[model samples]
Target: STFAYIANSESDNISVIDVTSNKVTATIPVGSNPMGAVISPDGTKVYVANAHSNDVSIIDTATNNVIATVPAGSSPQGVAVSPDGKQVYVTNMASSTLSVIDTTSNTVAGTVKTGKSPLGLALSPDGKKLYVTNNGDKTVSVINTVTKAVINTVSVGRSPKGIAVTPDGTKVYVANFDSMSISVIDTVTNSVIDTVKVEAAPSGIAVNPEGTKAYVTNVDKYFNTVSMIDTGTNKITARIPVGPDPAGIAVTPDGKKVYVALSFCNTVSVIDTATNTITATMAVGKNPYASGQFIGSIPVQPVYPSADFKSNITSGYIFLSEPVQFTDLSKDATEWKWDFGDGSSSKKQNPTHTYSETGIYTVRLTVSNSNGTDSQISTVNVVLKGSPTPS
Candidate 1:
């Protein structure tokens, strides 16, 4: 199941909505004036850019808690997570810098300078290049992710705010708020190939999973509509009415529906992609601005445990009343059981056992999870203290 995370700026919290029911399931308190939110590729975490706090909040999806807070530059406006989920990039509007946060340590690993007033950003499908919208300069900065260097600066419509890259990594769509249009950039040439006119004040944009269509949110209160563009023709196909002041937009993984965050009305509008109609409207927090990919699908994991282990007493000879340590090398196991032939047993993954009498015994280990179970057995020889070694 996928849930929409709405970053409510004025309320300083995130509203977690269940897509199936179109209802708010949880309200997570975050940093001041949260402006943007992006989910991890694996669906385990959410990275939020807090403008006023000048930091990013890393939320654990399982508990919906701010597990880590990483510092960023001034007025962090947008967040983007790497395709591999190892790094998070945050655009600082006031500082004109991109904070690269390493996920493993939850720290700002580096900073890449960008054009003035960077607002929105996106990464190519291969994650080799990053595109950032400089709101004040009316340009988009393309950066090489590996070298952390700006490779190209392309001129676009005025006040570009939202950006998205196609699934094929060939094209990028940028919403120009001041120009009432979107710019399509060719990734191969790193230049604007087409400028398609749309309704007034386009803000947030997202390309569908199939890369055949793109959805743009017109932020102007009077217009209050979402424009759908056919990727093949580079033309506006439909203007679907939504809530007022739409700011952030994203399409579901299945390409069935599009979600638009209505900033002024504290609500999120869902549009059915097939019909291009408003399917549902759910209440969220005040001034919701989920500028990035806020909805992510939880990956399905079907696995079984493999049983394997080794003992410290590998030699044939052993001493009585001496403890032997057992190490478990099981895979994906949640429960473990060890059966010692001397009438001793353990429920721990690793256990130490001692034999009192001299004899030969069989030690068995069983590991299991929800899927199934497995067992391994080995023989151990016990002898009197300071007794003989076997050849």
Candidate 2:
């Protein structure tokens, strides 16, 4: 199940949308001018930046309530969570610095200086670098994630406000607010490689997980829309009409849908990526997604991974000293660990085991990834089905 978090700037609240139903399921009042929001990779928490109040609010996903409001620098605008769920990076526009928060303590761990009026932020796929879009200086600042230092700055189109590094870690796509275009920068050279003309006043942008497409939001008052760009050609393939004053845009992890937040209309537009059309529209709080790059989804326990398998034994019984072939039936698993409950274990996706002794065997499988981890345990009956014990 996918979930979308929208920062309602005018209303000073956050709206959580359940993508499965295209509905706003929860509303949590945050602070004055809550504009930027990002979710942790594990889908356990959401970090929101309040522009006017100069603070960051952390919300617990399980309860949908504000757990902590940490002091942020002046006029925070953009926020990002690391993939490991241990660190949160927020861009404070007015102070011209970035705040790094340690998630375990919910405290400001450190700060890294950026170009003037930094408004948008993104991290590299490997979590080695962080990129900042400077609205005042019209440049992008690259920071080393580990060193907490500004490593480089690349000038982009005028008023670069929204930005995202492609999933491949090869390029960074920036939204030029004043130029009304997108500046594509080669991560290898740290220079602009191409520019794509988009609709009026493009502000926020996001790249799909596949790195083939980019979604940009436009803030033109009259003709607000979201533009779709083909990464390979560096061309605008489609301009999909969204809610009024589209501010920030994000895509699902599956790259199946795009979420656009409308600032003026107080709504969110959901687009079906395959068809390149609007499939659903839902009303949220006032002036949503002013910051542009927001969290797109949450993790569910049911979707993490379910472990099961098929065995060659048909009589619900297994024997000793014979190869028992196990076919994995688990869904959404990248790494699998299997235990035959006989002091033997395996790391293979699918494994075959020979029972040394005839007894009831407890087969367990643990499936996990960066998003989440879970295990399923089941008992395999090697003895009589109705017998009290194995002999």
- lDDT string, candidate 2, 281-318, tens digits: 88889888845345555554233445667778766676
Highest-lDDT candidate? 1
Report the Cα lDDT for residue 281, model 1: 88
Model 2 stretches with alpha carbons more than 4 Å out: 290-293, 296-391
Worst ten in a row by lDDT for model 1? 297-306
- List the RMSD of every prediction in angstroms: 16.7, 14.9
What does candidate 1's lDDT look like per residue over 1-391, in tens digits?
A: 6877889999999887667767565678889999988899999899889999999998877767788899999999999889899989999999999999999999988999999999999999888999999999999999998899999999999999999999999999999999998999999999899998876898999999999999888876576888888999999888988777888999988889899988878889998998988889888788888887999875532254678998888677578887899999999899999999889899998999998898999999988775445678988999876677666
lDDT of 1 at 216: 88
52: Cα error in model 2, Å? 1.6
Candidate 1 Cα lDDT to native: 0.88
Residue 210 shift from truth in candidate 1, angstroms: 0.6
Query: Against the true structure, what is each candidate's TM-score?
Result: 0.76, 0.75
